[model samples]
Target: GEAPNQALLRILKETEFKKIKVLGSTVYKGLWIPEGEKVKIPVAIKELREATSPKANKEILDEAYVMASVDNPHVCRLLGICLTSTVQLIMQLMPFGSLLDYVREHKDNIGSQYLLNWCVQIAKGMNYLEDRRLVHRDLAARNVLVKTPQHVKITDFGRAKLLGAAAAEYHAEGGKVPIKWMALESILHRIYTHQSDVWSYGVTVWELMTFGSKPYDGIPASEISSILEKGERLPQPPICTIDVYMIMVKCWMIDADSRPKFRELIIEFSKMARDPQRYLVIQGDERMHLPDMDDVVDADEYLIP
Candidate 1:
């Protein structure tokens, strides 16, 4: 129970004397050395790209601060930081890799049960963030990592923003934003909120259902806004049942207020996981519905170039 910065310093100092090894191109595969202990535990070291200014350093440290503060099982844990000539964030390693890659590689073998469970874990993690008044601007399958087939954790907080009680949203200053995954309000006004994160989560669910298929496939970045303005949403994946797809569609509601909260989504997904068979049989009310593919000239295409 130490200040995040203080905790980072203590962890770094203690690990200074331990053995280190470069793990990957971006992260160093290594172990964490606890304070007052000689034993070292496995950990992943993520090095920030060269920080040229105070602003850059602050941005990197901000992510570290957020990671250190959150203590959810579905969120990646920050073990410590190594403040050498270049800063490095020590974190818990997920050997299976990112959710995007995992789903793509195992799409054929993966069943609906695991996919639903992952969705629930992600919603639960986002709920925790919502409770803390944190907005993860980037909330996609790519930002989630697979610890095991049954476990996944949310990672990457580079674009996260902390909101005050009075503020429901934060305005973005402009950068390389994820257009396909962004909410309509965020795309139009650059306004970000927990609700926008929920919007991205819907696209993420689409990604998992389609086995890493790109959202808004076959559509150019320039036309997504106008297309969305015309009430066009992503087409449902062939494998996704009407019920689950309906939940995802709810997440894409034009009015952010109309969108279901993360906690509500958690409950919905949890029930599905509990009685998956009951949901398998589509009810009469859950009739087949099709997305507006009039503008989608290549509906049968897989990946959008």
Candidate 2:
């Protein structure tokens, strides 16, 4: 086993002159020193922020621990941790950046086949988490990182929870919630589970099809609960096929139990991938359409009326 002081020394030595760029949630882009080598590797480092509460500190450590325990090709790898001064978590860098950014920037050249491949990768990663009994409380395109144009990895597990003695649906307790991507039960009862993540994954698929378009565009976050209660879902993106949109609809089912698990999603995507001729044909009207304020609706009101 490598020593902590030795690891810290390598990290500082490698990133000595590298520019540090903030990559959200205290993660920074820097250089990493792989063991037994002096070479500098581009990597992402997450450090504990100053003035963090004990509970928050524990959570951060737990996140690192959880990441370290998992080893999957579709899941981002956790390199090492430095406990000196402030705790720092070392991770592999995804050069292509977030999935959202990739889809938005390359929508013109990226075909549905590639998008479905990315979805399959994401599902594979999520399935790994499920197999480990871990639940990603927040799963979205923004949380997924693009390792390359054809590959993606699930990341940002700060909000992930280990589901063992705990119930499937856990209370939020209080924090920022992504309302538009949330499941109906999570929105109403503050409950979170793997099923809730499946719901968010559906929204992520929508985001990919729409090239990073916001879900339920023009609707306020405060109104999402009521709107979901009224059974109104995000309108199908013009670029989405009827079959893919149907899968998203199944994920957004009101009952969590009815939602397909990540494993099932992987199987379904595999079938879709194999049947490229059937699933890859984009319709003539599959052009992009930006939603506007006129598309917005009040939560308490009916979608039609």
Candidate 3:
């Protein structure tokens, strides 16, 4: 993986990242040590297994290809790619880590304002992708990295596709689809469109509203198709009013063409963030009493199995 584009591509020699520690299978906390470098910080190094589909669909998806030319405040910055025995994407580690962990760990301690602020940022991120005719096949709270209560960046560019402006959908050729976060057409017909991305935003917003509550909590995977056919959607989050909840509902509209676009989402979420009092709004515990953190990282893995 030697190349002139050392800025974006580099082959780690005999030594890889220093102080490596597993954060999870697709996740890890490691330090990037350069020669005579003074500043050191823990960076998130995500492993692309025989994978990289959306973190594991490596053989098929190139997160680096889609994200290499990316430059957006709301979108995560890809520091470099190690095209080695195993593909590793080194990204800027968030101050508070995954939004899932941040929200769940401080579910009750945080205010709704932060949630609204985050909502806008993610919407902006999606809008950037949408502008490029790209579909983020996977979008969720866990994929969002937070710096502060008011700022967040979207990550996981592995499962994205930059399609033609006239062509808006990507078929699931063969891979583990995100059953819970996926839309009906995706789950049923194995088709992912801009609309499906919007649907995912609805579920992600539900996660944000509930401070990282599991989507479709306790529902068995096999019955998901039948359940959606019965005309059910995620229940309203405890803190959400109809005004706020409606945005999610609109995103989940049954017809693919009917859902709002990312641009619209940015405007809608911006209103809520700027003045949550208009809609009105609303985690937990000691370190030990908190919901088990281990299960949070692999929410996607459990959906299929």
lDDT of 1 by residue, 208-290 (tens): 98889999778898898999899999997877779998999999999999999999999999999887545433223233221
Q: How do all models score by TM-score?
A: 0.85, 0.81, 0.79
Candidate 2 error regions (>4 Å): 1-26, 38-40, 49-56, 280-305
Q: lDDT by residue for model 2 over 1-305, one digit each (tens)? A: 22222212223333332436988777788765444444455667777787256776787777777777667888877766776566777777777889898878866767666777887999999989887777887888998987677778898888887765646567768778778888888877877888888999899888988889988788889988888888888888776668878898999999899999999999887888766446655543245332122422221121111
Better candidate by TM-score, 1 or 2: 1
**Number of clashing residue pairs in every model?**
1, 0, 12
Estimate, for each residue in 1-305, the C-alpha lDDT of model 3 and write its tens digit.
22222224434432545536777757777765433433344567776656524445543237766665566778876656666656677666665788989888886676656777788889899888776677888999998887556678888776787665456577657766678998889888878887899999999999988988898889987788888889899998878879889999988878988999888888887878787656535522222222122212211121111
Q: Per-residue error at 153 for model 3, in Å?
A: 1.4
Q: Report RMSD (Å) for each prediction in the order shown.
A: 11.7, 12.0, 8.5
Q: Is candidate 1 or candidate 3 better by TM-score?
A: 1
Which model scores highest in TM-score? Answer: 1
Rank by TM-score, descending? Answer: 1, 2, 3
Return whichever of 1 and 3 wins on lDDT: 1
Please list the C-alpha lDDT of all candidates, in the order they appear.
0.79, 0.74, 0.72
Q: What is the lDDT of residue 148 in candidate 1?
A: 76
